[PDB]
C-alpha cells in the first residue's frame, strides 16, 4: 500500500549504503524497469510506519545489505514524479547473497566511489544525485 503527505505526494524513504564509517563508497542498485541504469535504493513508506523503519526495509529488501542506521540526510522533493523521500546514512555490516529482489527480479548491487554514483545518478536521478550535496 502507497502512501502519500497531504499534498499527494508519495513517502519515500532512501538509505545511502556506505562500506564504511569514511563514507567513500556507496551501494547502488539497478533499476526494475531498466537494468542497466543504476539508483539508490529505497521506496514507499507503508500506513503508519516510522521513515527510518521504511528506510532498512527497503534496503534489506532491494539491496540485500543491513548495518547501522546514522543520522537523517534530509527530505528531498521530485517534483516531476511527486515524490518527498527520507534520506538516511547506513553503514553496512551485513551483505546478504541471496536477497528478495535478487530472487524476484535479478536486481543487481555494486559499490561506487561517491563521485562515480553522482555521475551514474545524474542523467536519469538528479534529485538522487543531490542526495549526496551535503
Ligand atoms: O520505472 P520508473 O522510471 O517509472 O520509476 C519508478 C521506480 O523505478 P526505478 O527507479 O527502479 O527505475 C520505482 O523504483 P523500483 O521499482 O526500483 O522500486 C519507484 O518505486 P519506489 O522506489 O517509490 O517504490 P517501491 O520500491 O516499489 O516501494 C516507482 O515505481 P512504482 O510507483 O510503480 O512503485 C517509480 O515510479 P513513479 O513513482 O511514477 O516515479
Ligand atoms: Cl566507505
Ligand atoms: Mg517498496
Ligand atoms: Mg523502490
Ligand atoms: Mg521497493
Known amino acids: 500500500t502507497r502512501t ?4 499527494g505526494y508519495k513517502k519515500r524513504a532512501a538509505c545511502l549504503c556506505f562500506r564504511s564509517e ?32 521504511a528506510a532498512v526495509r527497503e534496503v534489506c529488501e532491494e ?6 542506521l546514522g543520522r537523517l540526510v534530509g527530505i528531498f522533493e521530485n517534483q516531476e514524479r511527486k515524490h518527498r523521500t527520507y534520506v538516511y546514512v547506513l553503514i553496512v555490516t551485513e551483505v546478504l ?11 543487481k548491487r555494486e559499490w561506487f566511489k561517491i563521485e562515480d554514483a553522482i555521475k551514474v545518478l545524474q542523467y536519469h536521478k538528479p534529485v538522487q544525485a543531490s542526495y549526496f550535496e551535503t
Not at 569514511?22 to 551501494?27: A, I, K, Q
Not at 539491496?63 to 547501522?68: D, E, N, R
Not at 547473497?97 to 536486481?107: A, K, L, P, T
Open 4 to 7: 502519500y503527505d497531504g499534498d
Open 22 to 53: 569514511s563514507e567513500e563508497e556507496v551501494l547502488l542498485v539497478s533499476s526494475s524497469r531498466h537494468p542497466d541504469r543504476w539508483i539508490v535504493p529505497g521506496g514507499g513508506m507503508e500506513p503508519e510506519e516510522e521513515p527510518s523503519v
Open 63 to 68: 539491496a540485500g545489505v543491513k548495518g547501522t
Open 97 to 107: 547473497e541471496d536477497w528478495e529482489d535478487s530472487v524476484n527480479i535479478g536486481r
